[PDB]
Scaffold this active site. Structure first.
Site, mmCIF file in Angstrom:
data_model
loop_
_atom_site.group_PDB
_atom_site.id
_atom_site.type_symbol
_atom_site.label_atom_id
_atom_site.label_comp_id
_atom_site.label_asym_id
_atom_site.label_seq_id
_atom_site.Cartn_x
_atom_site.Cartn_y
_atom_site.Cartn_z
ATOM 1 N N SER A 78 5.623 3.276 8.081
ATOM 2 C CA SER A 78 4.961 2.148 7.438
ATOM 3 C C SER A 78 5.783 1.615 6.266
ATOM 4 O O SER A 78 6.265 2.379 5.433
ATOM 5 C CB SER A 78 3.555 2.537 6.980
ATOM 6 O OG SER A 78 2.917 1.440 6.360
ATOM 7 N N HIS A 91 0.813 -1.211 0.000
ATOM 8 C CA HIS A 91 0.000 0.000 0.000
ATOM 9 C C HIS A 91 0.850 1.266 0.000
ATOM 10 O O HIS A 91 0.326 2.376 -0.069
ATOM 11 C CB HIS A 91 -1.004 -0.002 1.164
ATOM 12 C CG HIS A 91 -0.401 0.300 2.502
ATOM 13 N ND1 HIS A 91 -0.191 -0.670 3.460
ATOM 14 C CD2 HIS A 91 0.016 1.468 3.051
ATOM 15 C CE1 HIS A 91 0.336 -0.113 4.538
ATOM 16 N NE2 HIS A 91 0.475 1.181 4.314
ATOM 17 N N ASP A 101 -0.023 -7.476 1.824
ATOM 18 C CA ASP A 101 0.425 -6.086 1.885
ATOM 19 C C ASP A 101 1.934 -5.921 2.032
ATOM 20 O O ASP A 101 2.411 -5.240 2.942
ATOM 21 C CB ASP A 101 -0.289 -5.299 2.977
ATOM 22 C CG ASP A 101 -0.046 -3.807 2.859
ATOM 23 O OD1 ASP A 101 0.234 -3.352 1.735
ATOM 24 O OD2 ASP A 101 -0.113 -3.089 3.879
#
Ligand code: NA
Ligand code: NA
Ligand SMILES: [Zn+2]
Ligand SMILES: [Zn+2]
Lengths: 280, 5, 280, 280, 280, 280, 280, 5, 5, 5, 5, 5
Positions: G132, G36, G65
Site C-alpha cells: 500500500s 493513511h 489518500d
C-alpha cells in the site's frame, strides 16, 4: 493485452439485471443468467451503453442455477456474445470473467481453468456477486461458461446451458429425475471397520456399497419405505458402490420411471420399487 | 460418497 | 436476624483454602471441602481470625466432589461447625450459605431448600466460587450440606459426607461401582414411534426399557461386547426400564462383581456378563 | 410482612432521577444518589406521588460514586427517609433495596447483608439499574446504605455519605489524596520464587513487600521517578508489605503532602519524595 | 495456453495422499509432500490415472515441513515430475500450483513469484489445502517448489528439498541445531527509549542488540541459565545485534556444540556456554 | 419454616405438563398454566404423586399468556390449590414460586412482591422454566399469581385468570380489541426539540401527544389510512397524550367498534375512523 | 516473464515507509505514498538497497489518500520510477502491484485492470498492507497508479497524483469544496412508491431527484437550514436528480462560493444559499 | 495486593 | 433416561 | 527481531 | 410511550 | 444515490 480484445468482443453484450449480471445470447433479446439472480421475479435489464430495457423471466432451472430472460429489441442492435463450446476446454486455459455490476461498464477479472468436472468449471478468476450470471470467456472472447458466485470460483459450462436454452425460453421445467436419498460410498474395510466401533449408529452388513445416509422428507425413497442405514446393492441386477454412478441411472430413467431396488436392511433382504419424481 | 437429491 | 445467630455459631469454623472454602469438622483439624477446590493438591488454610495453618489433603472423592483436608491444632482451639442431619430436611426450610473467600470474614447468603433429590440439595441461596466447599446451614446454624458451585445452587447433603468421612481421612478411595453405559429410558410408544421415523439411527426392538445410548471407552461395558443401540431387558431376571434404577443394582453389587445382562440387539437375543469396575 | 412497614416508612421518599434512583434526605430537598446516575448533569426528579420537581446537582464524588441533588420544596411536605447508621451493621441482617424506576411506585427487593468491608456493603438483595442510587434499608426501614449497580450487589455505607454530605451540598470536591501507583503484595516465597522463573519480567530483590506493578500516566508517582518493578520498603521508616495499608497513610497525609519513599530498584537503594495529588 | 504444456508435463506425477497432495520424484516411487500432510502416519497414494498404491512415510522434517513417501512401482511406469532449481528464480516469474485433491485430475492455479526469501517462496497463485504438498512449477513445467497451505501463498524451495531427500529417504532426522531463545533486535534509540517508559518490564542496558524476549521451556538456553531480558552482546567475540544472524552461527555449529555467550543482565557481566540441541 | 406450610397446602396440586408447570383449580380437573407451555397442543399431566392423567387444552389466551387444561378425575381426589386474590397484594409481601419440573416433587423458591403493575406482578423469587405455569403463593399458601418465565421474575395476577377462566374452559377466544398502532408519548419540549434536529425523520407538529411510531401490517390502523408520524390528538373529543391511556378506551369499546380519530399529518387536519379488530 | 522487466524498471525506486510503501518520483527525493501510511507523521524511508534516509511529510490529502514525503539525496543516485498516464488505461491491461514491505526486496503481484471509474482503478492484483502506497505498473513498468489497501483492490490513478504533486510538495491543502449533505437518487416510482408505505419516515413530494438523506454536523448544509428529507430540485435553475452530478458542480464552484438551492420541504417551496467549505 | 489510585 | 458412569 | 527456536 | 397492539 | 461529503 489479449484480454482487452476478448472483452471488446463479448463485453458490450454483458448486462445488469435487477442483483446480478447476464449476457445477451442473440439479437432477439434472449438473455442468460443465474436462477439465483432471478429471485423468482417474472426484472430489469441495463446494457453497457446505458439502455434500460424491461426484461421478463421466461424460464428458470433452480438446480442448474441458470435462467433465461427476454427483452424486446428496439433502436440499436442488441450486442451479442459469441457462444463457444465447453467440451474442448483444457485445464490451464485462460478464463476471463466479465460482469456489469452498475450498468455502464465491465468489471473484468482474469485467471485460468482450474479444474474440469463438462460438469462444473472452477477458475482462479475472481468470481463475485458483481459478475455472477455474467459470462466466462476464453482467450478469444467466446463464452465457455456462466459465472456463479456462492480462492476459486465456479462456472456453469456453456454447452450445458445450450441444452436447456429452448426449454427455458418456452415452458420452463427441465427433467430432473430423482428419488431423494443421501448416499455414501461404503467399503468393507470401512464397513466391518464401522462394525467394530461399539458406538456406531448401525451395523453395516459388511460389503461395499452405497450406504443410505439419509432419507429426505416427502421423496419417492421415503414413499418406497427406504430407511436410513439401508444398503442398496443391485438396482435391477447391476452391482453398485458409487454414489456418483447411481446419481446417473436415475437420470437415464425417465420421470415417473419405476425402478426396483435390491437392498439389505441389516440381515434382511429387501426389494422395493421407487418411482422417480422431479427434483424441486 | 455424494448423495444430493 | 435469626441468621446472625446461625452464622455466629458455624461461621468462625469456615476457612479459606488455597481457590475455595471449607469448614472445620472437629478440634483435631479435620476439614471438609469440595474435591474441585483441591485441584489434586496434597494446600493452605486460613481461618476467619487470620490464622494460617498448613493443610494437606488426606482424601478425595472426585465423583461426590468432596475432600478431607487436615491441619495441625496449635494455640487457640480450632473453632468447630456443628453437624446436623440432611435426612429430615423439608423443602422450604431456611438455608444459609457461608463462605470465607478472603480469609478474614464470612460472606453469607440466604435462601430456602428449593428441592430435595438425600441425593442432592438445591437452594435459591446465592452459591458462587466464594462460598464453594463452605457449609450450608439450617436456621439453627448446624450444617446440613456442602455448597458446590458449578438462579439455583447445589449442595452435597451432609449425611453423605459423614459416610465417607473416615475413608477420606484414611486411605482415600470410595467404592463407586460402574459398567460404563449411557442409558436412556425407552417407551414402546417412543420405540415403535422411533421405528416409524425413516431417519432414526437404529430400529428399537419395540418394548420399553433402557436403550444403550453410548458405550464409553475402556469400560466394563465395552469389554463385555455391549454396543450402542443394545436394549438391556433383564439383569439376571429382573425386568428394568429405568436408567435411575439400573444405576443402583450395580452399586448394591460390589466392585469386581460379575453381572449377567439380558439384552436384545435388534432381533438377536444377547446375554453378557459385565464386571463392575471403579469409576475414576 | 415486616418489609411492608419498612417500605411504607422510607419508600415515599425514594425518587426517580433523570437514569437512576435517589432518596430525599430532608424537607429542604436534599437528595442522595449515585454519581454515575448524574452523568455530570447540573436533572429531573419524580417523587413516588407523581410530583416532578426540577433538581440540580450541587456536588459529585466520582470515586465514592455518590452525588447530592437539590430540589425546591413547594406544596406538600417532601417525604423524608430516616437515616440509620452503618457502623453497627451485622452480617446476616435483613436488607431491603428500594428503587423508583418509573416515578410512581417502589420496586422492592429483599436479602441480607452478605459481607461487610464500613468500607462497602454486599447484599444478596437484587440490585439493578432500577434501584441504583436508591436506599438500602434495615428491617426497621432506616437507610443503612446507597444501592450501587455495576448474584451479589453492592451498597455505599450510609455513614460514609453522611461525612461528605455538607461538602457535596456546598462546594463539591472531597479530599482524595493519592500518588498513582498500582501495587501488589509480594512475598519472599513469591519473590525468589519469581526470580527462579526464567521468563519473569524483572527479578524482585527477594524480600516481602509492595511490588510497584504499574505507574499510571501523569501521577505524582511518575513525576517522582517511580518505575514499574520498584519495591517500596519503608515510607519514612515504617516497614510495609500491604497494598491496603499503604492506601491509608497517604490519606492520613494531606493533599500536597510530600512523602519520602524508601525503595530498591533491583540492587540500587532509592529514596524519592512524592507529593500527594487529588484523585480525579 | 503455456500453462497447459507445463501441467501436461508434471501434472500426471501429482498424486493424492491420505489429506493433501504430493508428487513423484522418480520411477522408484519416491514421493515428496508436506510433513503436515503426513499426520505422523507411517498412508495411501492415488495417481492422476486412478491407480492406488500403498505408500509408507520413510522420513519427516516437521520444521521444514516436508516428507518423503515411498510406493512400490508395478504395472505402468510411475509418471515423474522434472526437478528444476530454485537458485535462479526471479521475482515475477510465472508460477503454477498443481494439486490432486480427489485423485483423478489436477486442480491448477496460476500466478507469479511474489517474493524470494532460497529461504521461502511466496506466490499469488491460489494455494489451498487442495494443492498442499503438491508442486509449484515454472512456465516450462519443472518443479521449483512445494506448495504449503497455512492473498499470497508459500512454497518450500525445491533445492531445499533436494538437500534432505536422501536423509528422509533413509533415516529421517535432519540436523536442526538450536538453543531455544526468542530474541528481538534492539536499538539504543529503542533501548534508552524503552528505559524512559516508567512501565517497561525491565531496563535495557542501552546498547544495540538481541534482547532475549523469552526463554522456552526445556531448552539449552534455559539449562545454561539464560533469562528473559538478558542482552547477548558477543558470541565468542563477534558483536551481534541481528536475530536473523544469530539464527545462523548456531546452525554452522554442529549439534551438541558448546557455544559461549557474552551477555549482560542489567548491570552484571555474564558469560555462559549453551550446548546446541536438536529442534523437535 | 412458614413456607413449608404454604407448600404443603398448594404444592400437591402443582403438576408437570408436557415443558412447563400447572396447578389444579378444582376437583373436576381444571388446570391453569401458561399459554406458552401449551405450544398449541390440544398434552400430558403428571401430579406430584406420580399419577399421569391425559389432559387436553380447552382454551388459550396468547396475549395474557395463560391456558386452561382439563383432566378426568379418577381414583384419588385431585388435590386442589386454594385461590387467593391479587387485589389486596402489598409490595413486600412474601411470594413463593412452586413448580413441578419432573413430576414427583416441588421445586420451591422464595422472595417478595417486588412491584405491582393488578396488571403484572414482579417478584425476586427465582422464576425459571422449571416453575413456569406454576403458582405464586402468599405466605398462607393461597395462589395470588401464575409464574411466567421469559434478577426479577413476572407473574400473571390470579384475579386476572379468574376472569377468563370460564371462557377458556368453554370456547377459547377472549375479547382483545385493538387497532394496531405503536404509539409514543410526545412532549412539546420533545417535539419542537425534535424539530430542531436537522436529521430527525419527520417534523412533529409541536404539541404534546401520542406520536404514531409505527403502523403494523394488516391492522385496522393501516386500513384506516393511519401513517407513521401521524399525531393523534382527540379520539372523538377527548384530548390524549398518554400511550397507556389510549390502550384503554379501545378496550372499553367493543370488538368491531368504529372509533373516529382526530390527528394531524404535519400541517393537515385528519379525521379517520378505525374499526377495532381482535388481537391475534 | 515480462513482469520481471517492469519490476526491474520501477522496483528499485519502491521504498518502505515507517507502515506502508512508497515510490521515489525524482532524483530530488520526492516520494509518493498513501496519506493513511502517514499517520500524520511529519517518518523513515528504506530503499530496496538497504539505504535508510530520513523523510519528512511535506503534504497530505486525506480525502484523496495520498501524501508526499521528502528525502535528501546523498551518495548513490536515488532510483526513480517512470510515471505513465492513467488517461489511456484500457480495462484488461496487465497491472503489477509492487511493494517494499521489509526494505530489502520487492513483493510483486500480478493482475489486470478490473474496472475504470480516471476516478479510481480496480484490479485483481493482490493489494495488501505490504504494497500500500506502492506503485501499480503497466506491462512496460511505468506507474499508472498508487496501490491503496482497505478479491479486488483499488489504486489511485497516477494522473490524479500528478495534479496535486506540487501543492503537496509545497503547502499541503488541496481545494475540496463541499456542503455536507448525504444525498440519494430518488425516482417518482420510488417516491410515490415510498409514499404508499405507511411506515416510511417522511412522504417524498413525488418527483425525481436527490433526496437529502442526512445532514452532517457542522457543515454548510446544516448552517443553511437544510434538513433531512428535503428534496433539492434546481441548484440555480439546473434540474438535478443525480447524486454523482451534484458532487461536481460544487467542485466547479470555488471554496467559499455561495450556491442557491431550490428545494421543497414536503409541500413548502424552499430556496437557501449554502457556502461551500473545505472537506476536512 | 490491591493498587487502585 | 440418565446414564452417567 | 525474529526469535524462533 | 408504550404502543403494543 | 451517493452522498459523501
Ligand atoms: Na429471601
Ligand atoms: Na494471472
Ligand atoms: Zn489471482
Ligand atoms: Zn434471592
Amino acid at each position: 493485452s489479449f484480454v482487452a480484445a476478448a472483452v471488446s468482443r463479448s463485453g458490450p453484450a454483458v448486462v445488469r439485471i435487477d442483483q446480478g449480471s447476464g449476457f445477451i445470447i442473440d439479437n432477439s433479446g434472449i438473455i442468460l443468467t443465474n436462477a439465483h439472480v432471478v429471485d423468482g421475479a417474472s426484472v430489469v435489464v441495463t446494457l453497457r451503453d446505458g439502455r434500460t430495457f424491461d426484461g421478463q423471466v421466461r424460464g428458470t432451472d433452480e438446480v442448474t442455477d441458470l435462467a433465461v430472460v427476454k427483452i424486446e429489441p428496439q433502436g440499436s442492435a442488441l450486442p451479442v456474445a459469441p457462444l463457444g463450446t465447453s467440451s474442448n476446454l483444457q485445464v490451464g486455459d485462460w478464463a476471463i470473467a466479465v460482469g456489469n455490476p452498475v450498468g455502464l461498464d465491465n468489471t473484468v477479472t482474469l485467471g485460468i481453468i482450474s479444474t474440469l468436472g463438462v460438469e462444473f468449471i472452477q477458475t482462479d478468476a475472481a468470481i463475485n456477486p458483481g459478475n455472477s450470471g455474467g459470462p466466462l470467456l476464453n482467450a478469444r472472447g467466446e463464452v465457455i461458461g456462466i459465472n456463479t458466485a456462492i480462492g476459486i470460483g465456479f462456472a456453469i459450462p456453456i454447452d450445458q446451458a445450450k441444452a436447456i436454452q429452448n426449454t427455458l425460453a418456452a415452458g420452463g421445467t427441465v427433467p430432473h429425475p430423482y428419488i431423494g436419498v443421501q448416499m455414501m460410498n461404503i467399503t468393507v474395510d470401512q464397513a466391518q471397520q464401522n462394525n467394530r466401533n461399539p458406538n456406531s449408529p448401525f451395523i453395516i452388513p459388511e460389503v461395499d456399497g452405497i450406504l443410505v445416509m439419509r432419507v429426505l422428507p416427502g421423496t419417492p425413497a421415503e414413499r418406497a419405505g427406504i430407511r436410513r442405514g439401508d444398503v442398496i446393492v443391485a438396482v435391477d441386477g447391476t452391482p453398485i458402490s458409487d454414489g456418483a454412478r447411481l446419481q446417473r441411472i436415475v437420470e437415464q430413467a425417465g420421470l415417473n420411471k419405476a425402478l426396483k431396488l435390491d437392498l439389505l436392511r441389516g440381515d434382511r433382504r429387501l426389494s422395493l420399487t421407487v418411482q422417480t419424481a422431479q427434483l424441486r | 460418497x455424494x448423495x444430493x437429491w
